[PDB]
Amino acid sequence: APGLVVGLNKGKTLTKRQLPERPSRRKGHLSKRTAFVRSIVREVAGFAPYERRVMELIRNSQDKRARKLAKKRLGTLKRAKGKIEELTSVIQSSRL
């Protein structure tokens, strides 16, 4: 397959290199300062009404309909699940 056009690892075999990391690909990494500021803003502002609804539903352990509510609010399951872990982490911290 290597050096064969067809196959699984198709293509010419060359002396591979280690590409230096791109600074533009570091984006999305949570900084210490960004994490600290967002914690302060969370503690000052609070939660959105739908975030309260999802939190209450998860507390009642109706997770499936909590996920459905989050998806209907945000718009995607990817974002809906991401909010689910965020609010799940919040409630566990509150109970502890």
Binding site: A1, L4, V5, L14, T15, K16
Partner: protein, 202 residues
């Protein structure tokens, strides 16, 4: 109407096209204008070459990857290997392409040698006449405006000449390998699904 031998007509001429017809009567006039501007630029920027040095890259497709063409500029990694500072390169006329990167030592060595030849054949005038500093020519009397194409062209890889036929080549089935590897790639996903499903069942 349609009653004659030949193709069915397809003339996209139902808009007001006569307003937007484009004629080419200025084709020699445009050609002469480009040359005069080209000659003006060469006289304005002399002695340095009219066209900057470009790297040698490979086009990105199975249809063209066997050819070597000219790129936009030398990558940061290539300049660092050649010993040219990123800031200095743009001053002495070495284009720098931040977007490109060297995935193979073959391409890196190709352009590194390309820069090294350019540096060896380069004459850099001192900023102040009479005091050469680091990279700087002591004698600049013989400077002339030449062409980078004459000094250093983009050369395609030479077609391999005759080589002996080995026994390991003799006992090699080209068509069977092609069909086997195509089927191997085609059912790679199904095999992995079978193996994982069997594993969880076990």
């Amino acid at each position: 109407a349609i009653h004659v031998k030949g193709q069915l007509p397809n003339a996209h001429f139902h808009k007001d096209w006569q307003r937007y017809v484009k004629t080419w009567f200025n084709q020699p006039g445009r050609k002469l204008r480009r040359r005069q501007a080209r000659q003006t630029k060469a006289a304005k920027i002399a002695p340095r070459p009219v066209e900057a040095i470009r790297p040698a890259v490979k086009p990105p497709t199975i249809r063209y990857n066997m050819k070597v063409r000219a790129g936009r500029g030398f990558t940061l990694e290539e300049l660092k290997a050649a010993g040219v500072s990123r800031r200095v390169a743009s001053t002495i006329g070495i284009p720098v392409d931040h977007r490109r990167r060297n995935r193979s030592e073959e391409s890196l060595q190709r352009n590194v040698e390309r820069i090294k030849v350019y540096l060896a054949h380069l004459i850099v005038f001192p900023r102040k006449a009479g005091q050469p500093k680091k990279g700087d020519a002591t004698d600049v009397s013989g400077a002339e405006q030449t062409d980078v194409a004459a000094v250093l062209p983009i050369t395609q890889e030479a077609v391999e000449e005759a080589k002996p036929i080995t026994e390991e080549a003799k006992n090699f089935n080209a068509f069977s390998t092609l069909s086997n590897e195509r089927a191997y790639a085609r059912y790679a996903g199904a095999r992995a699904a079978f193996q994982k499903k069997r594993a969880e069942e076990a």
